[PDB]
Design an enzyme around this catalytic site. Sequence first.
Site, PDB file in Angstrom:
ATOM      1  N   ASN A  80       1.855   5.370 -11.513  1.00 55.41           N
ATOM      2  CA  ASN A  80       0.663   6.222 -11.624  1.00 55.41           C
ATOM      3  C   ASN A  80       1.029   7.661 -11.998  1.00 55.41           C
ATOM      4  O   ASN A  80       0.237   8.380 -12.606  1.00 55.41           O
ATOM      5  CB  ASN A  80      -0.090   6.228 -10.297  1.00 55.41           C
ATOM      6  CG  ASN A  80      -1.222   7.243 -10.271  1.00 55.41           C
ATOM      7  OD1 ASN A  80      -2.241   7.112 -10.989  1.00 55.41           O
ATOM      8  ND2 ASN A  80      -1.041   8.283  -9.458  1.00 55.41           N
ATOM      9  N   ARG A 108      -8.937   8.623  -9.959  1.00 58.39           N
ATOM     10  CA  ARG A 108      -8.058   8.081 -10.991  1.00 58.39           C
ATOM     11  C   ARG A 108      -7.418   9.044 -11.963  1.00 58.39           C
ATOM     12  O   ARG A 108      -6.299   8.783 -12.411  1.00 58.39           O
ATOM     13  CB  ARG A 108      -8.788   6.974 -11.730  1.00 58.39           C
ATOM     14  CG  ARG A 108      -8.789   5.723 -10.841  1.00 58.39           C
ATOM     15  CD  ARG A 108     -10.039   4.942 -10.941  1.00 58.39           C
ATOM     16  NE  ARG A 108      -9.990   3.661 -10.238  1.00 58.39           N
ATOM     17  CZ  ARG A 108     -11.042   2.858 -10.181  1.00 58.39           C
ATOM     18  NH1 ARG A 108     -12.180   3.256 -10.740  1.00 58.39           N
ATOM     19  NH2 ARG A 108     -10.985   1.692  -9.546  1.00 58.39           N
ATOM     20  N   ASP A 141      -0.005  13.247 -12.878  1.00 57.69           N
ATOM     21  CA  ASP A 141      -0.745  12.006 -13.099  1.00 57.69           C
ATOM     22  C   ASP A 141      -0.649  11.547 -14.555  1.00 57.69           C
ATOM     23  O   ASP A 141      -1.173  12.211 -15.458  1.00 57.69           O
ATOM     24  CB  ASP A 141      -2.223  12.203 -12.719  1.00 57.69           C
ATOM     25  CG  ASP A 141      -2.920  10.902 -12.387  1.00 57.69           C
ATOM     26  OD1 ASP A 141      -2.562  10.302 -11.348  1.00 57.69           O
ATOM     27  OD2 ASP A 141      -3.840  10.479 -13.133  1.00 57.69           O
ATOM     28  N   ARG A 179       5.198  -4.853  -6.881  1.00 63.72           N
ATOM     29  CA  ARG A 179       4.160  -4.183  -6.118  1.00 63.72           C
ATOM     30  C   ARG A 179       3.740  -3.037  -6.988  1.00 63.72           C
ATOM     31  O   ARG A 179       4.577  -2.258  -7.411  1.00 63.72           O
ATOM     32  CB  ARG A 179       4.713  -3.682  -4.765  1.00 63.72           C
ATOM     33  CG  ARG A 179       3.809  -2.683  -4.085  1.00 63.72           C
ATOM     34  CD  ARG A 179       4.515  -1.935  -3.038  1.00 63.72           C
ATOM     35  NE  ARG A 179       3.625  -1.155  -2.203  1.00 63.72           N
ATOM     36  CZ  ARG A 179       3.406   0.146  -2.306  1.00 63.72           C
ATOM     37  NH1 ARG A 179       3.968   0.914  -3.234  1.00 63.72           N
ATOM     38  NH2 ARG A 179       2.574   0.691  -1.448  1.00 63.72           N
ATOM     39  N   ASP A 230       2.341   0.304  -6.996  1.00 65.20           N
ATOM     40  CA  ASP A 230       2.059   1.441  -6.153  1.00 65.20           C
ATOM     41  C   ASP A 230       0.811   2.202  -6.621  1.00 65.20           C
ATOM     42  O   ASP A 230       0.556   2.348  -7.810  1.00 65.20           O
ATOM     43  CB  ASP A 230       3.294   2.364  -6.149  1.00 65.20           C
ATOM     44  CG  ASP A 230       3.095   3.606  -5.293  1.00 65.20           C
ATOM     45  OD1 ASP A 230       3.012   3.445  -4.056  1.00 65.20           O
ATOM     46  OD2 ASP A 230       2.979   4.723  -5.868  1.00 65.20           O
ATOM     47  N   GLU A 242      -1.359  -2.232  -4.726  1.00 62.39           N
ATOM     48  CA  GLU A 242      -1.697  -1.489  -3.503  1.00 62.39           C
ATOM     49  C   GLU A 242      -3.011  -0.735  -3.731  1.00 62.39           C
ATOM     50  O   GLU A 242      -3.051   0.263  -4.428  1.00 62.39           O
ATOM     51  CB  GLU A 242      -0.640  -0.480  -3.140  1.00 62.39           C
ATOM     52  CG  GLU A 242      -0.910   0.173  -1.772  1.00 62.39           C
ATOM     53  CD  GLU A 242      -0.541   1.636  -1.702  1.00 62.39           C
ATOM     54  OE1 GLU A 242      -0.471   2.168  -0.578  1.00 62.39           O
ATOM     55  OE2 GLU A 242      -0.363   2.257  -2.754  1.00 62.39           O
ATOM     56  N   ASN A 255       2.700  -1.731   7.130  1.00 63.69           N
ATOM     57  CA  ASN A 255       3.579  -1.444   5.987  1.00 63.69           C
ATOM     58  C   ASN A 255       4.373  -0.141   6.212  1.00 63.69           C
ATOM     59  O   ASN A 255       4.255   0.492   7.237  1.00 63.69           O
ATOM     60  CB  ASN A 255       2.840  -1.434   4.649  1.00 63.69           C
ATOM     61  CG  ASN A 255       2.063  -0.158   4.405  1.00 63.69           C
ATOM     62  OD1 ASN A 255       1.874   0.684   5.288  1.00 63.69           O
ATOM     63  ND2 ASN A 255       1.575  -0.033   3.203  1.00 63.69           N
ATOM     64  N   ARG A 272       3.532 -10.888   4.029  1.00 62.80           N
ATOM     65  CA  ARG A 272       4.651 -10.009   3.947  1.00 62.80           C
ATOM     66  C   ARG A 272       5.041  -9.514   5.344  1.00 62.80           C
ATOM     67  O   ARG A 272       4.231  -8.983   6.137  1.00 62.80           O
ATOM     68  CB  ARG A 272       4.339  -8.807   3.039  1.00 62.80           C
ATOM     69  CG  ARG A 272       5.491  -7.797   2.940  1.00 62.80           C
ATOM     70  CD  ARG A 272       5.199  -6.681   1.965  1.00 62.80           C
ATOM     71  NE  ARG A 272       4.183  -5.797   2.520  1.00 62.80           N
ATOM     72  CZ  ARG A 272       3.481  -4.933   1.815  1.00 62.80           C
ATOM     73  NH1 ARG A 272       3.733  -4.769   0.525  1.00 62.80           N
ATOM     74  NH2 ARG A 272       2.558  -4.200   2.414  1.00 62.80           N
TER      75      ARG A 272
END
Length: 496
Positions: A100, A158, A167, A195, A197, A233, A298, A337
């Site tokens: 990201n 976002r 970003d 995964r 992120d 995630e 987590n 997990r």
Amino acid sequence: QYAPQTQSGRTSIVHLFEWRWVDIALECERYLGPKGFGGVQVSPPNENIVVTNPSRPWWERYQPVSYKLCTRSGNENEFRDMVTRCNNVGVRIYVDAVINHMCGSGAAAGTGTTCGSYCNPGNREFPAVPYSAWDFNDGKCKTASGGIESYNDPYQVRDCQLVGLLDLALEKDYVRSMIADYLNKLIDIGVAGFRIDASKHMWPGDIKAVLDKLHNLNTNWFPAGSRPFIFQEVIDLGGEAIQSSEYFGNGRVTEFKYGAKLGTVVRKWSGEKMSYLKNWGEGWGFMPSDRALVFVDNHDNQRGHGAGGASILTFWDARLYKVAVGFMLAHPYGFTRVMSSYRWARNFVNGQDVNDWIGPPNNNGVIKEVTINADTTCGNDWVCEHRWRQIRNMVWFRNVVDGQPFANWWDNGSNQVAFGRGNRGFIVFNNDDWQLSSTLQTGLPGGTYCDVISGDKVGNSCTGIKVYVSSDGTAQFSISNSAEDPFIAIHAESKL
Ligand SMILES: OC[C@H]1O[C@H](OC[C@H]2O[C@H](O[C@H]3[C@H](O)[C@@H](O)[C@@H](O[C@H]4[C@H](O)[C@@H](O)[C@H](O)O[C@@H]4CO)O[C@@H]3CO)[C@H](O)[C@@H](O)[C@@H]2O[C@H]2O[C@H](CO)[C@@H](O[C@H]3O[C@H](CO)[C@@H](O)[C@H](O)[C@H]3O)[C@H](O)[C@H]2O)[C@H](O)[C@@H](O)[C@@H]1O
Ligand SMILES: OC[C@H]1O[C@H](O[C@H]2[C@H](O)[C@@H](O)[C@@H](O[C@H]3[C@H](O)[C@@H](O)[C@@H](O[C@H]4[C@H](O)[C@@H](O)[C@@H](O)O[C@@H]4CO)O[C@@H]3CO)O[C@@H]2CO)[C@H](O)[C@@H](O)[C@@H]1O
Ligand SMILES: OC[C@H]1O[C@@H](O)[C@H](O)[C@@H](O)[C@@H]1O
Ligand SMILES: [Ca+2]
Ligand SMILES: [Cl-]
């Protein structure tokens, strides 16, 4: 995207959080392979910025400066070696893909990075990639501060900066392609999936455009035409503007409602009781089981101020944690997990651990090896939950019962409950303040079964409690409320 690509009959993965590559390669051979674990989630393998204040926190690894495989966990050769050695004994590798963002916009220009790459965050300059200013969302974000000022506006979430991190302009093909090239390199080395992120901070369609560029998995270990396993995630506890269901078309999604709600129940907070778990799963408003990745804690929320807050259970709460993990691994919902942690000096100041930054066990910034003691525990302050008998044996339980339906639920109307999985497993819990002594239908064939919580099956005997099951499938379970582990589990492969 939804299939984990584990060896047939292996149903969990473990997060070896901040472990070094050489130690994981070893652990695969000596332990994870023989004990039936499906895979390992590793920490971010790409180069990150060095943070000296505070001193080398775990979270510096969520601030990329390049896609070179060069970190405190090891270098590229060590990474490759780990992936080869783990795959060769049937244990897959899943990489934490930080895509990201790059590092904090306020970090200083220099070579204070884990492989010595140069970057200049203030100029949006990352020459080792390379990225330049037009590769970031500065012009797109509409807030005065440049950061996320409101989470009920999806655009801000976002296109703006998450805690000051630069970003990436993920709508651009150039940026999508640089990220795909990185992931594809890892796929060709032999990793089984990713995964993703901070997926909440990306548009579902931008993630999709990246995933569409990804290679099929390496045919040394996987069948032709195999697609990488994707789990995203997204933190969504309900009543937010962005929903986990927006990401179902890309892969699985972390279901953070699971641990938050289970923690509250096992702790008996807010009026909750274990008997309410009768309809656990989609019945509690969770996403579909075939889209869910689940877990009790987590790496972020085990520090106590993440998704789920104080209700989250962890190794610090060992007795109740084992109960929750046990329930999870027994229950058919989701793909599971298991967490593996390190110990740190907690310091609470107004219900806040101010040492939540502390990184893994280290000598002057160099991560300590994982040592294995005679009793199979780890030293050097690695917790190694995955090696606790109660957890390892419930990992095996899940393998043994895979595919069998939920069945034979019983409860006492409070916090004593039991259920089975077809005719291959049964588990009983006492989380009440008084004794459990009841004869229950287990669904299993008659015979004598070792309880895999209090011990193991060794040759033609049990090292812990034994349970005699009658020909009609019933057995007596007696669990004191002061039992060390207040639950019992028996299955087809613990039968004498
Ligand atoms: O800017 C340079 C800056 O670099 C360093 O980091 C800055 C912040 O990073 C750390 O945050 C980590 C999280 O704790 C950790 O959980 C994880 O985040 C993940 C998250 O948990 C998960 O849910 C998810 O989806 O992914 C996330 C990332 O992958 O990793 C994080 C990043 O390493 C610190 O904990 C965090 O507190 C630091 O933020 C502090 O400074 C920044 C920058 O000033 C603050 O941002 C605010 O101020 C800005 C002023 O303009 C504004 O732009 C921004 O929008 C504001 O929100 C932040 O709030 C403050 O706490 C160093 O920490 C820092 O010293 C360097 O200067
Ligand atoms: O006692 C409470 C606090 O103490 C702890 O943090 C320490 C650091 O670990 C120290 O090294 C020091 O920080 C130095 C820093 O090492 C140095 O790089 C420089 O900071 C630069 C920064 O690197 C750069 O990216 C840019 O932003 O500019 C900075 C220059 O201002 O200077 C620092 C000292 O000014 O001091 C702190 C103490 O605050 C502890 O871990 C903290 O959690 C705690 O609050
Ligand atoms: O691709 C999905 C798209 O969703 C749009 O709503 C976003 O504005 C755009 O940035 C993104 O690329
Ligand atoms: Ca973003
Ligand atoms: Cl996660």
